[PDB]
């Protein structure tokens, strides 16, 4: 099992520092070496730092050279990235990658993790449980839902029931509004449930400690 | 830093069917040393991006004949030859033969299944949102194929209005569907002033649209 | 940038009729070298402009004996001698002997015709309307001559109203009539408010107006 | 055969940038100054640009002065019209012209793409079926139409019987209501088809591609 597992990331204002970092296992972790890579906003992927196994030559593109750093804590497996003067092009998820024995293209990607860099204050989300009202009438089944508004950063988690519906759920994509995302997760479920029993979805906001649950009641 | 186009932006491809992405550097790939390092990566969704292709021609191991690399210098193909339905994801070439590194911008794989309407649902905005001075009615079209779909808000009929959000899914995994949701926001008042809201959908599986509406009021 | 006025902007002439346009400049035209670029232009109905007679007067190519361009120095005329259905349409004069270019306001050549009365149709509100909740009651003036029409919406006794949609038709080709397309649009529950919806023509070829109607109840 | 087409017009938010281009054809280019023209809303007509044939020196009158300039490729066979700042006083039809040999006057139009510049969105028609009520009447000829309400921006194709039913049918103008488009079109068959014979009437809007058909049902 080769696993490369990031840590770090976090939402920093537009020219704070903060050090990112990655542990490694299931492989020999000085024979290879090991960068860093972002994934923005529109999906494009940069690499951003390449360090040799033994940590003497180290690599960077223009735009972080000089305000990031790459770090390889090899007795303790630890591989860091120290950046500063984050400017909002380095908001993006970073993963942690390995190169092959042949130290010019990757093998393998950790989980990643996120930065978001904006001055903008993290804000808990307001969670609104949407009943069906409509037209037309019920039968064979039912589609009910909860408009998770307002919130930063990103991410919020949702989950119907606690986990133990997962049968027709989506949860769509958050788009921002004024510095301030709104999602909202559909679910169905047959007719003869919503009423008598019930469906509840349960909001966690990581960046707050915020945790909702809204029943969806008629 | 070497440009790598990549085209298509998307390749709707049948499940039984070969696909072939292409991939082109500005400058050449062909290292002087023996040769290229041009890679195939693939990012099935929510997932971390895997290796399927390095030095243009050899799978990575798990990697099943059926994916096969291909070119030299500067343009570069990669060939799915029949396609299965995990294969949905964003493929980038990347090379690295010269520093720094660069990817391609990405070719999204897109399974295509037959036509599936839209399941449209509409909700009146919840008391608890009203109370605190706003209104969201969100209307959900859920499970559909194709992606486009064009949807309109109709306050009191006439009211076509502009003030709303928008969302879709990627394909889903499952059943190479799409979910799209939207979303009009407006304040107590302004809801308040009228009576009858609309989510109106028009999507190639129906020649008429499908139109779902409530009236803010009916007792 | 000479400012050309063109008199008349409308034109019945029977068949037959010669048709005299005149197109005067707030400025000199007249150029000493070469007397003047003036130009005519016709814009038949749905076509681009062709030009008709160039240098105030010289036929282009294919343009009849019937066109012939007279005037000099700052006033010119177009005379269109036995005027045929074919050349309905708007004139523009323009100058080109200065800068900015400058084109006129246009003629619109309308062929007389024996009068008619207009074929009228009245429409309520689709159950498909209604239901994204508005309202729109439609009546057809079709096939008429000449162009004055007055279309008075009555719901419910002698009680007109404020919101209605009129466009006509331009001259119609072979067959020289109008037509006219009058819809009114209320929301769905003022429709619901009321039960006589009466589209009511006037027009010269009648004293009594042409009263088209329905009562608000299928049944 | 003088042939000369634009192509390139379309829905441009007030501030925009466009580029329409024209090729010309079946004469020779380079011998030919060029033009284009435009056609506003109240049909008035408007000279907007001049190359001489070499394109070596551009006239433009004074509303357009600065903000658009005119092309032209005596290779490839190319006019255009480079429009930035778009303001909405630039909504109209342009055409793109031939100059005679004293290029002075214009002696070949060519068919014109149309320009909208509005802050509104692209939205697809609805249509209603216009099926007889009316004060009753089974004549000889039966009127039915449909209606194409809330679209934008032009232009809609209404057909009827996908063409094969062609005879009197009237497509009057569309207008504007608030910000949108609406326009309806009559048909008239005889009173014996038009039950016992489906008619349909279908509209295209191009700009969102949609293609709806109506059947007129009683
Ligand atoms: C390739 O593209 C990049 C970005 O446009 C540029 O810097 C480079 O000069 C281009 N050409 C070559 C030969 O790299």
């Known amino acids: 099992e080769v696993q490369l597992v990031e840590s770090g990331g976090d939402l920093v204002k537009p020219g704070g520092s903060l050090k990112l970092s990655c542990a490694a296992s299931?492989?020999?972790?000085?024979?290879?070496?090991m960068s860093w890579v972002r994934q923005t906003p529109e999906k494009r992927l940069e690499w951003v730092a390449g360090?040799?196994?033994?940590?003497?030559?180290?690599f960077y593109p223009d735009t972080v050279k000089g305000r990031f750093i790459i770090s390889r804590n090899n007795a303790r497996n630890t591989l860091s990235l120290q950046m500063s003067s984050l400017r909002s092009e380095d908001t993006a998820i970073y993963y942690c990658?390995?190169?092959?024995?042949?130290?010019?293209?990757?093998?393998?990607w950790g989980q990643g993790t996120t930065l978001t860099v904006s001055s903008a204050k993290t804000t808990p989300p307001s969670v609104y449980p949407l009943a069906p009202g409509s037209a037309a009438q019920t039968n064979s089944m039912v589609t009910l839902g909860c408009l998770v508004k307002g919130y930063f950063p990103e991410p919020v988690t949702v989950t119907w029931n606690s986990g133990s519906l997962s049968s027709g759920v989506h949860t769509f994509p958050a788009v921002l509004q004024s510095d301030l995302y709104t999602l909202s997760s559909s679910v169905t479920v047959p007719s003869s449930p919503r009423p008598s029993e019930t469906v509840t979805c349960n909001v966690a906001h990581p960046a707050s400690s915020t945790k909702v649950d809204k029943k969806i009641v008629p | 830093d070497v440009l790598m186009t990549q085209t298509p932006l998307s390749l709707p491809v049948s499940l039984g069917d070969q696909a072939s992405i292409s991939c082109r550097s500005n400058?050449?790939?062909?290292?002087?040393?023996?040769?290229?390092?041009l890679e195939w990566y693939l990012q099935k969704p929510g997932q971390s991006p895997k290796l399927l292709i390095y030095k243009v021609s050899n799978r990575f191991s798990g990697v099943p004949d059926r994916f096969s690399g291909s070119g030299s210098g500067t343009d570069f193909t990669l060939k799915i030859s029949r396609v299965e339905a995990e294969d949905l994801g964003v493929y980038y070439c990347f090379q690295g033969s010269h520093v720094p590194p660069t990817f391609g911008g990405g070719t999204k794989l897109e399974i295509k299944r037959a036509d599936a309407a839209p399941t449209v649902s509409i909700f009146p905005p919840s008391s608890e949102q009203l109370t605190s001075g706003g209104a969201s009615v969100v209307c959900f079209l859920n499970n559909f194929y194709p992606k486009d779909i064009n949807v309109k808000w109709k306050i009191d009929g006439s009211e076509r209005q502009n003030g709303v959000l928008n969302s879709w899914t990627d394909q889903d995994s499952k059943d190479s569907t799409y979910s799209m949701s939207s979303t009009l926001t407006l304040t107590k008042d302004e809801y308040e002033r009228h009576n009858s809201y609309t989510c109106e959908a028009t999507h190639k599986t129906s020649t008429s649209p499908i139109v779902k509406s409530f009236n803010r009021n009916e007792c | 940038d000479v400012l050309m006025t063109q008199t008349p902007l409308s034109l019945p002439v029977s068949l037959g009729d010669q048709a005299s346009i005149s197109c005067?400049?707030?400025?000199?035209?007249?150029?000493?070298?070469?007397?003047?670029?003036?130009?005519?232009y016709l814009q038949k109905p749905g076509q681009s402009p062709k030009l008709l007679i160039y240098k105030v007067s010289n036929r282009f190519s294919g343009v009849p004996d019937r066109f012939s361009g007279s005037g000099s120095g700052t006033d010119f005329t177009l005379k269109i001698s036995r005027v045929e259905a074919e050349d309905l349409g708007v004139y523009y004069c323009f100058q080109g002997s200065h800068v900015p270019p400058t084109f006129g306001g246009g003629t619109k050549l309308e062929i007389k015709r024996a009068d008619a009365a207009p074929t009228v149709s009245i429409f309520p509100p689709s159950s498909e309307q209604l239901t994204s909740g508005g309202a729109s009651v439609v009546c057809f003036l079709n096939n008429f001559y000449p162009k004055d029409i007055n279309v008075k919406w009555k719901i419910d006794g002698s009680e007109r109203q404020n919101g209605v949609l009129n466009s006509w038709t331009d001259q119609d080709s072979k067959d020289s009539t109008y037509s006219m397309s009058s819809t009114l649009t209320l929301t769905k529950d003022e429709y619901e408010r009321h039960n006589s919806y009466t589209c009511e023509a006037t027009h010269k070829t009648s004293t009594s107006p042409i009263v088209k109607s329905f009562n608000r109840n299928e049944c | 055969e003088v042939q000369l087409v634009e192509s390139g017009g379309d829905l441009v938010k007030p501030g925009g940038s466009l580029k329409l281009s024209c090729?010309?054809?079946?004469?020779?280019?380079?011998?030919?100054?060029?033009?284009?023209v435009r056609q506003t809303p109240e049909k008035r007509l408007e000279w907007?640009?001049?190359?001489?044939?070499?394109?070596?020196?551009?006239?433009?009158?004074d509303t357009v002065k600065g903000r658009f300039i005119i092309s032209r490729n005596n290779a490839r066979n190319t006019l255009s019209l480079q429009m930035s700042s778009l303001r909405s006083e630039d909504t109209a039809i342009?055409?793109?012209?031939?100059?005679?040999?004293?290029?002075?006057?214009?002696?070949?139009?060519?068919?014109g793409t149309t320009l909208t510049v509005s802050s509104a969105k692209t939205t697809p028609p609805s249509v209603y079926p216009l099926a007889p009520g009316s004060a009753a009447q089974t004549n000889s000829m039966v009127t039915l139409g449909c209606l194409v309400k809330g679209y934008f921006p032009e232009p809609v194709t209404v057909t009827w019987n996908s063409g094969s039913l062609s005879s009197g049918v009237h497509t009057f103008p569309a207008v504007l209501q608030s910000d949108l488009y609406t326009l309806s079109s009559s048909v008239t068959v005889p009173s014996s088809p038009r039950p016992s014979e489906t008619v349909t009437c279908n509209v295209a809007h191009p700009a969102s591609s949609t293609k709806v058909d109506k059947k007129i049902v009683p």
């Open positions: 299931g492989f020999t972790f000085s024979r290879c070496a």
């Open positions: 990658t390995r190169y092959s024995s042949d130290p010019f293209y990757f093998d393998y």
């Open positions: 400058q050449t790939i062909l290292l002087s040393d023996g040769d290229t390092y």
């Open positions: 360090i040799s196994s033994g940590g003497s030559y180290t």
